[PDB]
Design a protein around this ligand. Structure first.
Ligand SMILES: [Cl-]
Ligand SMILES: [Cl-]
Lengths: 290, 290
């Protein structure tokens, strides 16, 4: 909890939002995805200490951030995460010369933010990220396909709200090493309570843009992907071996993007737990050249 | 289906048991574990073609072997698997000069078979195997610790018989690559029906010797581990990187066994799906020296 003690709190739309904030300078913003928190970045951030104002927010209802009132099936959508995070980013004075370091849904949020604040961005470092919409399930990793489809059905509530299956099944299956009990416990902690506390981890898989659904997210991702293909903003692609989300043909498409630096590290999906020092060193070295 | 079309059948305690059998000579017996079948060995066996009589059985209630009558909480124990497999091996004339190639519960069965038929064994090649009893849950891999704890509780029936979680969550989580939908379907096939058809995948986790339970398995595993430490029978340890079951201090213990050759291949638990040719070549070269 010495990491957890380091968190500051800010009131955003009446909700207490937790975030790490260390140092001064232009912001380097680390965005976690599902079902993680700023904790995912704990071993990467020290590699950027003194290189800027390091910020890693706990997304709404995640980490040490407050949960939403009257939480339901429509709670914790992508748009809602935007409202809270963007406002948090605004309140923290994150408006210019921003470096983004992004993963999974953190990359959905980060890419969208950069696309809509294209003049405010110094560089984008991304990994195991949302870099496409999917026309079919055929392009969705077999590793999680059945689980994800089941989550895209009424069964999801049982799996997630009652059984915590995203945290308990999907996290460890996509890390190469074993987590310590301590680490897995911190990932459990925001979601230990059965019921609505675990809602962020179910809505996220339901927000993944597949076959046009959801419409708002599909359009949103399609827009930023088109823009990433043209923008001269420096990009660091942290490729994973073997990887999960960015493998095969997706990799080829990502590699066509302009002003792109690439480093490969060992990992599946939650690659921060497998190669944090290689990731941090790569981000530091690349950032230094911006 | 050209692989399944290859299976021969034998009646064992009134039940049909399926098996691959190719070639002639001294038997080379490939034993799968949970929740798999002889299919797991399909890319490894060709490396031993013409080196002996190749035999890959489907365990009772698994692959294309029959399901047991009146299946319930007491069915498909380790003892029961021995009853069927050991009878199959006797009925196939696997009685001398036997080379074993074993994995997971296949290794529990193979190691026990070897211990109880010590004058019949030419060599034992093993990977991601049952090589210890565990004195506490802390020594069980975090990757599936909570899952296994849940499975061993009364919650097990719901997780497996209804939700088929061992096949759906635990298999893809412990292979480095993505399986094809075709490959995953073959592992799904014996367990497509909800209910007791899935019992073997539930009783197996309940049979892992942890904190002295079950008593019978703990004792037979301790007994064969003691013997493996003493026997001159040649052993090939196929170590997996990063591995799941045999990692950390477990490796050190296995490495102390006499007449042991070691090769490391990439993989998690179901390593045959990640490094079949490396495994096949290692077995072939080692077998050549026996
Ligand atoms: Cl997700
Ligand atoms: Cl098992």
């Amino acid at each position: 909890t010495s990491f957890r003690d380091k968190k500051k709190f800010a009131t955003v739309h009446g909700k207490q939002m937790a975030y790490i904030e260390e140092g001064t300078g232009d912001p380097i913003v680390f965005l976690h995805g599902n079902p993680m928190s700023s904790y995912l970045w704990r071993n990467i951030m020290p590699h950027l200490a003194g290189k800027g104002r390091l910020i890693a927010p706990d997304l709404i209802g995640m980490g040490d951030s407050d949960k939403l009132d009257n939480s339901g099936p429509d709670s914790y959508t992508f748009a809602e995460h935007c409202t809270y995070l963007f406002a948090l980013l605004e309140q923290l004075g994150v408006t210019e010369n921003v470096t983004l370091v992004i993963h999974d849904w953190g990359s959905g949020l980060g890419f969208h933010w950069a696309h809509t604040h294209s003049d405010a961005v110094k560089g984008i470092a991304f990994m195991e990220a949302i870099v496409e919409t999917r026309e079919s399930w055929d392009a969705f990793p077999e590793r999680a396909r059945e689980m994800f489809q089941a989550l895209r059905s009424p069964a999801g509530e049982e799996m997630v709200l009652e059984k915590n299956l995203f945290v308990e099944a999907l996290v460890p299956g996509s890390i190469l090493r074993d987590l310590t009990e301590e680490e897995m416990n911190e990932y459990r902690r925001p979601f230990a309570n059965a019921g609505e506390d675990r809602r962020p981890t179910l809505t996220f898989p339901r927000q993944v843009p597949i076959e046009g659904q959801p419409k708002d997210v599909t359009e949103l991702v399609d827009a930023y992907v088109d823009w990433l293909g043209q923008t001269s903003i420096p990009k660091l692609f942290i490729n994973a071996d073997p990887g999960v989300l960015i493998t095969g043909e997706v990799r080829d498409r990502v590699r066509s993007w302009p002003n792109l630096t690439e480093v490969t590290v060992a990992g599946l999906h939650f690659i921060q737990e497998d190669s944090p020092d290689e990731i941090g060193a790569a981000v530091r070295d690349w950032h230094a050249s911006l």
